[PDB]
Structures are given as structure tokens and as C-alpha cells.
């Protein structure tokens, strides 16, 4: 039985989009959605076309939608294989929340990292050791892996 709330999330982002963000549904699956965050203005990641892919679980919209960060990125809140460590993808989900706010709060994650609650701890200790260095390294990784 296909749930309506699933396709709604698509039909809304087609009707009304989020500036900096382009995305696409799949003909094969309404529970799986394809996304590119245009990288942020005046950022170490400025110029990157970060791809990601998104899944809507059988519980949705009583619990969270999951997401994998499919372009390489060097940052405090992303695990060695693309797992995005952001709490909103876990904690206190509700039906008021949309695939719209999920994509906006990961646009936020690129534009504003957290080095006070990290999971890539080697990058957090780089950002405490020298911010400008972490900036060069994030740029060097953007230019090598993200510009297509």
C-alpha cells in the first residue's frame, strides 16, 4: 500500500524549492530521492556540487528519514564512509517536519560545521590547531573530489 505523505514531499519540492538546493525523484521508487547541494558562498566548500541520496522509511512521518553523503567532503560531522552525524536525522522527529527541512538543515551543515560536537575528531583537532589550515584542507578536498 503506497503512502501518500511520501509523494507529497516530492510534489511540494517540485512546486516550491530551497535556494542552493536542486533535487530529483526516481521513477523506480517514491521512497528514494536524489539531491545536489550547491556549495556555500564564501566557504572552504564554495564551488562543490555535493551529491547525496535520501530514504523515507516505512515509519515516515512518525520517525526519521535517513541520508548518505555520496560526494567526498572533509568536515567534523561526517563518518569515514559518508554517514551524516546530524541529530535531526534521529532525535524528536514529527509529522510537522518535511523532506524540505531535512535538506535545509544539511545545507546548514555545509555552511556551518560543528567542531564542539564532532565525530570526525581528527578534523575537530585540526580546526582547534589552525582554522585557516582546516579551511585549505577542506578546499583541497573540495577541488579534488566535489567539482562535477
Amino acid at each position: 500500500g503506497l503512502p501518500r505523505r511520501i509523494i507529497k514531499e516530492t510534489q511540494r519540492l517540485l512546486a516550491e524549492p530551497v535556494p542552493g538546493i536542486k533535487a530529483e525523484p526516481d521513477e523506480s521508487n517514491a521512497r528514494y530521492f536524489h539531491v545536489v547541494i550547491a556549495g556555500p558562498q564564501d566557504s572552504p566548500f564554495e564551488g562543490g556540487t555535493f551529491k547525496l541520496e535520501l530514504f523515507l522509511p516505512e515509519e515516515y512521518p512518525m520517525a526519521a528519514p535517513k541520508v548518505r553523503f555520496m560526494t567526498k567532503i572533509y568536515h567534523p560531522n561526517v563518518d569515514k564512509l559518508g554517514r551524516i552525524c546530524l541529530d535531526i536525522l534521529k532525535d524528536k522527529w514529527s509529522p510537522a517536519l518535511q523532506i524540505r527541512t531535512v535538506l535545509l538543515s544539511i545545507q546548514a551543515l555545509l555552511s556551518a560545521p560543528n567542531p564542539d560536537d564532532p565525530l570526525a575528531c581528527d578534523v575537530a583537532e585540526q580546526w582547534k590547531t589552525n582554522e585557516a589550515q582546516a579551511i585549505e584542507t577542506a578546499r583541497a578536498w573540495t577541488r579534488l573530489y566535489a567539482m562535477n
Binding site: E16, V18, P19, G20, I21, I37, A38, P40, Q41, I88, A96, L97, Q98, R100, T101, L104, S105, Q107, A108, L110, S111, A112, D116
Partner: protein
């Protein structure tokens, strides 16, 4: 000037303000009209966090611009 907000769960609201108003003031106006306390709100402009004691001017926000919003606890 007037500017807008269009992200929550199926609502628009509007913001009538000057170009040198702080974002801490803007937050107070959103608490004044949607109820959300100023520490919970984070406002975003084009994949960009709006820092609390800066202004419309510092982000180069202008007439008819549209902000969006995410809610947390720590931070501003």
C-alpha cells in the same frame, strides 16, 4: 522594508523592518508572531547561518528576500 519566511510545515509569514536591524531583533519578532523562543530558532539565508548580533546589511539582505528556519538549542 518588508521581507518574508516560508519554511515550517505549510505556512508563510512576513517581516516589516529596517536594513540595520539586528538578527537578535528579527528572532524576537518571530517569537512575537509564531511563539518560538529566541534560543530555539536558527534562521538561514541561502545555505548560510544568520549570526544573532549582525544585521540585514552584514548579510546583504534586501527588500522581498525569503529566509527559512531550523530549530535546536545550543548556539545563538
Amino acid at each position: 522594508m518588508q521581507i518574508f519566511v516560508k519554511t515550517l510545515t505549510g505556512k508563510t509569514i512576513t517581516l516589516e523592518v529596517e536594513p540595520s536591524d539586528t538578527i537578535e531583533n528579527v528572532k524576537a519578532k518571530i517569537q512575537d508572531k509564531e511563539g518560538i523562543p529566541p534560543d530555539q530558532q536558527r534562521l538561514i539565508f541561502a545555505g548560510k547561518q544568520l549570526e544573532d548580533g549582525r544585521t540585514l546589511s552584514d548579510y546583504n539582505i534586501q527588500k522581498e528576500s525569503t529566509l527559512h528556519l531550523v530549530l535546536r538549542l545550543r548556539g545563538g
